[PDB]
Design a protein around this ligand. Structure first.
Ligand SMILES: [Zn+2]
Ligand SMILES: [Zn+2]
Ligand SMILES: [Zn+2]
Ligand SMILES: [Zn+2]
Ligand SMILES: [Zn+2]
Ligand SMILES: [Zn+2]
Lengths: 153, 153
């Protein structure tokens, strides 16, 4: 049983707390928590490569992509490791997060510990937006909040 | 080869950037950067076990101590992995950090990535304070600032 945690903070109203739990060494990871201060709708939700917060989220680098794939959604075969799709905020601006993912890991080459979790301004189009950028980033706009994923008890 | 970074922030105005570089996994880690807003003198400087800053620096847990040793200074055989000693602030409140350490690592079970770096109120007594706490925490007082250590480019 391995656990991780991430506090999401930014320059504006967006903040949250995200927990990760992996029961078995190469098993699925449960992702749960809450993010507040959002606009109602979909917000892109990504693990970026670097746990570099020195310039806030500006510093986090590209999507975590150890297997040199293209951008997609979490249910796609063709995805980056860090492609966790979207979270959904309600009209109160709160997103209750509840994800199970079998590509991210809390150990080894797919490990996300020490990387940056980012929530975005816009929806991630999951590689289905109709331009070149869709296949790289998903066109999810500004980085509203982020944090470094840390080992938890 | 390996690099890591950490932004230290407080509930007060203690701000720092700390870099880690390890040229090979069997080598020392160079720790460099700066911390401002400190009182003149010595401030304890630790890697705490958990990269959990959900409730600020308290969430970070005890000293990182994978080998089940007692507290010391970084030059001691008997130390925790996370025992990096003290940093020194000048009368301008700035500590310029320059450390080489052979016990922390950026890989393996002495790896510090995803853990919390903390700078303290007071001096760590390095195990040489004359009470039982000295052998556990070093009596360095409150956690002034902290952040989660992340993978860098
Ligand atoms: Zn992103
Ligand atoms: Zn992606
Ligand atoms: Zn942004
Ligand atoms: Zn400490
Ligand atoms: Zn210690
Ligand atoms: Zn404190």
């Amino acid at each position: 049983a391995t656990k991780a945690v991430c506090v999401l903070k930014g320059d504006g109203p967006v903040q949250g707390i995200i927990n990760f739990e992996q029961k078995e060494s190469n098993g699925p990871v449960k992702v749960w928590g809450s993010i507040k201060g959002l606009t109602e709708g979909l917000h892109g939700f990504h693990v970026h490569e670097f746990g570099d917060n020195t310039a806030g989220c500006t510093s986090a680098g590209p999507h975590f992509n150890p297997l040199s794939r293209k951008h997609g959604g979490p249910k796609d075969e063709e995805r980056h490791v860090g492609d966790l799709g979207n979270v959904t905020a309600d009209k109160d601006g709160v997103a209750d997060v509840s994800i199970e993912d079998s590509v991210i890991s809390l150990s080894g080459d797919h490990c996300i510990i020490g990387r940056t979790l980012v929530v975005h301004e816009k929806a991630d189009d999951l590689g289905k937006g109709g331009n070149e950028e869709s296949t790289k980033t998903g066109n999810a706009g500004s980085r509203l909040a982020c944090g470094v994923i840390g080992i938890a008890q």
